[PDB]
Structures are given as structure tokens and as C-alpha cells.
């Protein structure tokens with residue numbers, strides 16, 4: 258047994274997810290070892306994506322811990338994500354099947370539209386022209402959602418959702434004539450310096466779960482993150498609350514999310530910290546502590562993907 262939340266399609270999502278993205282210069286082998294350790298530590302939710310270029314390794318970890326008798330496939334909740342070069346409806350299923358082939362799994366638990374801006378089809382995840390301009394594409398995301406809906410009916414994705422969507426883009430889907438399946442979730446940046454209260458309230462009102470990424474203040478990887486942004490985990494209120502609970506600022510930041518009804522991801526390729534992060538189920542924060550963490554909020558968005566700014570669907 259482990260702590261899960263019922264999703265709006267009646268499937269269940271473990272409330273603590275293991276993030277698998279590392280910058281490109283971390284060797285891909287380390288994804289294989291970290292996922293296994295994560296499973297061993299008690300993570301039942303594993304978050305990946307096509308664009309992370311680690312689905313072979315993360316799929317191997319998963320198949321390995323199933324085959325060795327440590328866990329059943331039914332007790333692993335695996336997420337993949339549809340990259341922006343496969344938004345065209347006819348390219349949706351093939352992208353999911355490519356992911357499944359790379360993973361050697363029969364199905365994904367959750368398939369998300371990764372980012373609402375589209376780019377030109379082909380093998381390249383960031384297609385550029387000769388002068389280095391990104392090759393944007395024009396795709397109706399409602400059609401992409403219909404093709405997502407079909408992957409669910411094919412049983413290739415048990416649930417479907419979205420990531421990096423804003424209010425307008427969510428509403429666009431929710432109001433679609435003939436809508437068959439709401440997004441079960443909206444995976445977005447969420448932490449004590451960017452707490453997403455408004456967007457969180459909105460998703461609650463539609464029974465969409467907010468899934469928090471960069472919950473620990475991000476991989477901080479340049480140039481995607483401004484090195485002058487403050488380091489979340491160095492916050493004195495978070496460090497004071499850690500100290501007081503004999504926990505860590507990480508655990509405080511994760512517990513905060515669980516208690517406000519957010520599903521929280523946490524990446525780590527360090528054995529010690531992987532095991533530490535599951536301790537988020539061993540303590541609780543009082544109302545006064547929670548309000549304290551609320552007060553940290555400051556509109557610090559770490560991650561903007563601003564190479565994809567300009568088109569109308571850019572969400573930020």
C-alpha cells in the first residue's frame with residue numbers, strides 16, 4: 258500500500274512521483290540505476306518523456322524490478338509525454354508506440370501533451386532551419402487531444418493529461434465540442450516561490466490534479482535557468498522548518514505540496530537523497546507552518562522554454 262489520489266477518469270495516481278530528467282551531460286546509464294533505486298525506496302510513480310532521451314533506460318529499470326519480483330506492473334504508475342514534433346493528430350499514436358517500443362512496456366499509465374507549442378514533424382525534437390530558427394508548426398491542439406483520447410481507447414494510455422497548460426489552454430480543451438475525456442492532470446512548475454494558487458484552484462474546480470515539477474527549485478541547468486535566480490532549498494524559513502522537524506528543506510517543500518492537494522515530483526540520482534525523499538510520508542506540517550510557506554511566494558518562475566516563445570500557444 259502507498260498513498261494515491263483518484264483521478265477524474267477513475268484511475269489512481271501515486272502522490273509522490275520520481276522525476277527522471279537529467280541534463281544531457283549526465284550519462285544516460287545513471288537513469289537506469291536511479292529508477293531502480295527509486296522503486297527500491299518506495300516510489301510507485303515514475304515520470305519520463307520522449308524528449309528526455311532516457312526511455313530505454315527507464316523502461317529497462319522498470320522491466321528489471323518487475324522481472325526480479327520486487328514490484329508488479331500494476332504497482333508502477335509510468336508517465337510519458339508527447340513531444341511537440343508529434344502534435345499532428347496522425348503522429349500522436351505513432352509517437353506513443355515509439356515510446357512504448359523504447360520502454361518495452363505494453364502501456365503507459367499516463368500520456369501528457371508536453372508543451373502546447375508545436376514544431377515541425379520529424380526525428381529532431383528541436384527542428385531548426387539553416388539559420389538556426391526553430392521550425393514552428395501550426396496544429397489545432399483540440400485535434401491533438403482527440404488523437405490522445407483514441408490512444409486511451411486503444412488501452413495504450415490508461416489516462417491522458419496535459420503539461421504546461423494555462424487557464425486559456427485548459428479551457429480550450431474542457432470546452433471542446435464532443436469532449437470525451439477531460440485531462441486528468443496539468444503538470445506544471447510548482448514550488449514555495451511559485452505556488453500556483455490560482456491555477457491550482459482552477460484545476461481543483463474541474464477535478465484536475467496539479468502535478469508539481471521543479472518542486473525542489475529545479476535542475477538549475479543553464480541556459481534554461483537564470484543562475485541569478487535564488488536557490489529555493491537555501492531559503493531560511495524552509496531551513497528553519499527543516500531544522501525544527503529534523504528533516505531537510507527538500508522534505509518540507511515536498512510535504513507542503515502534498516498537504517495542499519498537489520501531486521509532487523522529485524528528481525534525484527543520489528541514493529541517499531532518493532531514500533530521504535520518501536520520508537515525506539513520515540511527518541506533517543501544521544496550519545501555521547503551511548501559511549508560513551505560503552508567504553514565501555514570489556512569482557519566481559524558474560523554467561520558461563523561451564526558445565518556444567512567439568507563437569500564440571506559448572503559455573507563459
Ligand SMILES: NC(=O)c1ccc[n+]([C@@H]2O[C@H](COP(=O)([O-])OP(=O)(O)OC[C@H]3O[C@@H](n4cnc5c(N)ncnc54)[C@H](OP(=O)(O)O)[C@@H]3O)[C@@H](O)[C@H]2O)c1
Pocket residue numbers: 275276277278279304305371420421444445469470471472473474475476477490505507508522523524525526527530531533534560
Ligand atoms: N513537464 C515539464 O515540462 C517538466 C519540466 C521540468 C521537470 N519535469 C519533471 O519534473 C522532474 C523534477 O523536476 P527537476 O528535475 O526540475 O528537479 P527537482 O525535483 O526540483 O530537483 C532539483 C534538484 O534537487 C536535487 N535534490 C533532490 N532531492 C534532494 C534532497 N532531498 N535534498 C537536496 N537536494 C535534492 C536533485 O539533485 P540530485 O539528483 O543530486 O539529488 C535535483 O537536481 C524532472 O525530472 C521531470 O521528470 C517536467
Ligand SMILES: COc1ccc2c(c1)c(CC(=O)O)c(C)n2C(=O)c1ccc(Cl)cc1
Pocket residue numbers: 278306308309382383421481560561562
Ligand atoms: C518549460 O521550461 C522548460 C525549459 C527547458 C526544458 C523544458 C522545459 C523541458 C521539458 C521537461 O523538462 O519536461 C526540457 C526537456 N527542457 C530542456 O532543457 C530541453 C533539453 C533538451 C532538449 Cl533536446 C529539449 C529541451
